[PDB]
Amino acid sequence: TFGSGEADCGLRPLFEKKSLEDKTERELLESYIDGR
């Protein structure tokens, strides 16, 4: 209802919502069979 409210989940106010990356998140994304 939507989720438990959110819906908004997993998007961080200071990072995803401002299109800013954290310092190491590239390491995660590069291990997911890189991607392209």
Binding site: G3, S4, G5, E6, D8, C9, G10, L11, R12, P13, L14, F15, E16, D22, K23, T24, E25, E27, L28, L29, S31, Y32, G35
Partner: protein, 259 residues
């Protein structure tokens, strides 16, 4: 967290501290999954071998934190619990199978830049992302060095720490330990050869293992810090509760009340 680094501010706005209120101590990590619900490991609350048995009034949840020991005056929110729910088949006698618990907060928290829930995975997010070799991220305020064997080299952090770790193949997991591994667990960590280190450690139990989806850019909680032999010991791995395999009970209990 062993061999991690300091989190950025707002890097993990779902991290919760489980805090007991006399004596004042950090018990465990936890995570915010909505405005009223916190997810943690059942062993944080209930562990008869050690006569641990916390109820609601024994505990405070603290949300929005970065500093381990400061009261973060206009940033953190402290909340009280109204109900604790442990999985009815949590196995504390043998292997900590179904190491999961839900806490209902007495009243909802407000979100902010520092406080924001994580998502729970669905079937296809689980299927796709839970694969050996893919990295996830663990956070917490636990020891920096081995403490079921209490350590030096620095001890406890001042601020929230972070480490990214690969998921490991189930055979190497099961072959690293004498404990019986279930399907409700997975393991994570670097292998002796791979050069890199890192692990959770004591005081980190209960907190999130999260991964970011490459399809929709959201953070999903795939595990809970559950157990491990030592901290960062070579040829040993951390074990996590498998959040997707237990999602029906999660839904079941937040639908039953559910209010």
């Amino acid at each position: 967290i062993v061999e991690g680094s300091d989190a950025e501010i707002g890097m993990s706005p779902w991290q919760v501290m489980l805090f007991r209120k006399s004596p004042q101590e950090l018990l465990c990590g936890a995570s915010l999954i909505s405005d009223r619900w916190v997810l943690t490991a059942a062993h944080c609350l209930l562990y008869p071998p050690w006569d641990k048995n916390f109820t609601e009034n024994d505990l405070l949840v603290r949300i929005g934190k970065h500093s381990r020991t400061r009261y973060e005056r206009n940033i953190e929110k402290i909340s009280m619990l109204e109900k604790i729910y442990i999985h009815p088949r949590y196995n504390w006698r043998e292997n900590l199978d179904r190491d999961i618990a839900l806490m209902k907060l007495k009243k909802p928290v407000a979100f902010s830049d520092y406080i924001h829930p994580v998502c729970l995975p669905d079937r296809e997010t689980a299927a796709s992302l839970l694969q050996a070799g893919y990295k996830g991220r663990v956070t917490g305020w636990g020891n920096l060095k081995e403490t079921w064997t209490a350590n030096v080299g620095k001890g406890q952090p001042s601020v929230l720490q972070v480490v990214n770790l690969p998921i490991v193949e189930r055979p190497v997991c099961k072959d690293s330990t004498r404990i019986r591994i279930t399907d409700n667990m997975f393991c994570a960590g670097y292998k002796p050869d791979e050069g890199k280190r890192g692990d959770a450690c004591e005081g980190d139990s209960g907190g999130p293992f999260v991964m970011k989806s490459p399809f929709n850019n959201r953070w999903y909680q795939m595990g809970i810090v559950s157990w491990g032999e030592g901290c960062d010991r070579d040829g040993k791995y951390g074990f996590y509760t498998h959040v997707f395999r237990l999602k029906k009970w999660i839904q079941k209990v937040i639908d039953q009340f559910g209010e």
